[PDB]
Design a protein around this motif. Sequence first.
Motif, PDB file in Angstrom:
ATOM      1  N   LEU A  81       0.855  -1.207   0.000  1.00 56.67           N
ATOM      2  CA  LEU A  81       0.000   0.000   0.000  1.00 56.67           C
ATOM      3  C   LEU A  81       0.883   1.247   0.000  1.00 56.67           C
ATOM      4  O   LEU A  81       1.945   1.226   0.630  1.00 56.67           O
ATOM      5  CB  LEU A  81      -0.894  -0.009   1.236  1.00 56.67           C
ATOM      6  CG  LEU A  81      -1.779  -1.244   1.402  1.00 56.67           C
ATOM      7  CD1 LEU A  81      -2.562  -1.141   2.689  1.00 56.67           C
ATOM      8  CD2 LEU A  81      -2.716  -1.427   0.208  1.00 56.67           C
ATOM      9  N   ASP A  82       0.442   2.293  -0.683  1.00 59.80           N
ATOM     10  CA  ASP A  82       1.006   3.659  -0.568  1.00 59.80           C
ATOM     11  C   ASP A  82       0.023   4.436   0.303  1.00 59.80           C
ATOM     12  O   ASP A  82      -1.179   4.480  -0.058  1.00 59.80           O
ATOM     13  CB  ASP A  82       1.235   4.271  -1.952  1.00 59.80           C
ATOM     14  CG  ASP A  82       2.416   3.671  -2.701  1.00 59.80           C
ATOM     15  OD1 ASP A  82       3.292   3.065  -2.049  1.00 59.80           O
ATOM     16  OD2 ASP A  82       2.458   3.807  -3.943  1.00 59.80           O
ATOM     17  N   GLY A  83       0.463   4.928   1.460  1.00 61.61           N
ATOM     18  CA  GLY A  83      -0.352   5.793   2.332  1.00 61.61           C
ATOM     19  C   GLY A  83      -1.167   4.994   3.333  1.00 61.61           C
ATOM     20  O   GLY A  83      -0.767   3.867   3.662  1.00 61.61           O
ATOM     21  N   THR A  84      -2.276   5.562   3.796  1.00 68.90           N
ATOM     22  CA  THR A  84      -2.952   5.137   5.043  1.00 68.90           C
ATOM     23  C   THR A  84      -4.374   4.716   4.701  1.00 68.90           C
ATOM     24  O   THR A  84      -5.053   5.488   4.011  1.00 68.90           O
ATOM     25  CB  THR A  84      -3.009   6.280   6.048  1.00 68.90           C
ATOM     26  OG1 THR A  84      -1.662   6.587   6.375  1.00 68.90           O
ATOM     27  CG2 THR A  84      -3.775   5.924   7.304  1.00 68.90           C
ATOM     28  N   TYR A  85      -4.758   3.515   5.123  1.00 70.32           N
ATOM     29  CA  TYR A  85      -6.105   2.967   4.857  1.00 70.32           C
ATOM     30  C   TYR A  85      -6.821   2.763   6.191  1.00 70.32           C
ATOM     31  O   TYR A  85      -6.341   2.046   7.098  1.00 70.32           O
ATOM     32  CB  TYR A  85      -6.002   1.684   4.028  1.00 70.32           C
ATOM     33  CG  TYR A  85      -5.587   1.843   2.590  1.00 70.32           C
ATOM     34  CD1 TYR A  85      -4.290   2.144   2.246  1.00 70.32           C
ATOM     35  CD2 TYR A  85      -6.475   1.610   1.557  1.00 70.32           C
ATOM     36  CE1 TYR A  85      -3.916   2.305   0.921  1.00 70.32           C
ATOM     37  CE2 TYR A  85      -6.115   1.743   0.231  1.00 70.32           C
ATOM     38  CZ  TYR A  85      -4.817   2.044  -0.103  1.00 70.32           C
ATOM     39  OH  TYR A  85      -4.423   2.113  -1.415  1.00 70.32           O
ATOM     40  N   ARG A  86      -7.977   3.401   6.312  1.00 71.85           N
ATOM     41  CA  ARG A  86      -8.746   3.414   7.572  1.00 71.85           C
ATOM     42  C   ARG A  86      -9.765   2.271   7.621  1.00 71.85           C
ATOM     43  O   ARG A  86     -10.522   2.098   6.681  1.00 71.85           O
ATOM     44  CB  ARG A  86      -9.405   4.785   7.643  1.00 71.85           C
ATOM     45  CG  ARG A  86      -9.669   5.259   9.048  1.00 71.85           C
ATOM     46  CD  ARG A  86     -10.256   6.649   8.915  1.00 71.85           C
ATOM     47  NE  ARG A  86      -9.247   7.687   8.876  1.00 71.85           N
ATOM     48  CZ  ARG A  86      -9.521   8.989   8.802  1.00 71.85           C
ATOM     49  NH1 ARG A  86     -10.766   9.406   8.693  1.00 71.85           N
ATOM     50  NH2 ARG A  86      -8.538   9.869   8.804  1.00 71.85           N
ATOM     51  N   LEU A  87      -9.802   1.514   8.722  1.00 75.25           N
ATOM     52  CA  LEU A  87     -10.782   0.416   8.896  1.00 75.25           C
ATOM     53  C   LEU A  87     -12.189   1.017   9.010  1.00 75.25           C
ATOM     54  O   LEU A  87     -12.432   1.896   9.892  1.00 75.25           O
ATOM     55  CB  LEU A  87     -10.426  -0.401  10.133  1.00 75.25           C
ATOM     56  CG  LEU A  87     -11.395  -1.534  10.483  1.00 75.25           C
ATOM     57  CD1 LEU A  87     -11.391  -2.659   9.445  1.00 75.25           C
ATOM     58  CD2 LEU A  87     -11.055  -2.087  11.839  1.00 75.25           C
TER      59      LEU A  87
END
Length: 257
Positions: A81-87
């Motif tokens: 992944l590139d960057g931030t993934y929120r649940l």
Amino acid sequence: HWGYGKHNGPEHWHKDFPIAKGERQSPVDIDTHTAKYDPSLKPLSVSYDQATSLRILNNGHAFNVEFDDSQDKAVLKGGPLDGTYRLIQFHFHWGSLDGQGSEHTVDKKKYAAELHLVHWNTKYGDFGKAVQQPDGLAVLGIFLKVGSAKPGLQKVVDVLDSIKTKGKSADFTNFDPRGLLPESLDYWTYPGSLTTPPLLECVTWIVLKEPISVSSEQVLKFRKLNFNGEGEPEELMVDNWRPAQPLKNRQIKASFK
Ligand SMILES: NS(=O)(=O)c1ccc(S[C@@H]2O[C@H](CO)[C@@H](O)[C@H](O)[C@H]2O)cc1
Ligand SMILES: NS(=O)(=O)c1ccc(S[C@@H]2O[C@H](CO)[C@@H](O)[C@H](O)[C@H]2O)cc1
Ligand SMILES: [Zn+2]
């Protein structure tokens, strides 16, 4: 009106969702001999210590455990992944029998069920915007086999009686999704789609190699849920899985040797 019945199941979905026959559909079979180790893939970073669960919903297709995604409280980073993934939510897909239920397969092996922890890319601001982007979602897929109980699952199993039918919800606070993880975070990754309509091609799939074990009693309680609403004829919520779709022009990468 899409579903998993004899007349509205996965082989019917293309008639309302033509992307069903697209170039990057999920799930797929993971051929372990053809997946290429990618030494450039980072360890996955699962940061769920501040997760805020809110609610559990029977949506007529599965049940969703929903999280507060209005801040960076439970995020997936690293790996592919590139960057931030929120649940935003997790849910399962499961079988009428222990011999089927997973969406992904491993060398054509079906597991009894599959957990999907769904995350959206915070550079798109909300989930509705993210699903319109080829890198909008990251779904962490975890296989379930039947054996020893999963202690961290039992709080989910025990609330299902209160959301037996479509449209029912219940308060579901202070649930710790770390209790659903296996020991190892070794994974396969490939580009794919939502596995239910609208089947949008917006997902980076991260599927863990190590399955979790659940007890026969735990999965039996999943199979007591209903697809139907209250006061309608009982249709057991079982076999809510889409089968493997053509890989087409895609490479599955392995984080491990
Ligand atoms: N998957 S899809 O969105 O392309 C789709 C598929 C089928 C329909 S009609 C279908 O008919 C069946 C026998 O009457 C009924 O038993 C079903 O409940 C009903 O859904 C509508 C939409
Ligand atoms: N099986 S999967 O991980 O590929 C997947 C598939 C779809 C979605 S979302 C969308 O909206 C809500 C859920 O927030 C649900 O209530 C909807 O029914 C669902 O269609 C998300 C993930
Ligand atoms: Zn799913």
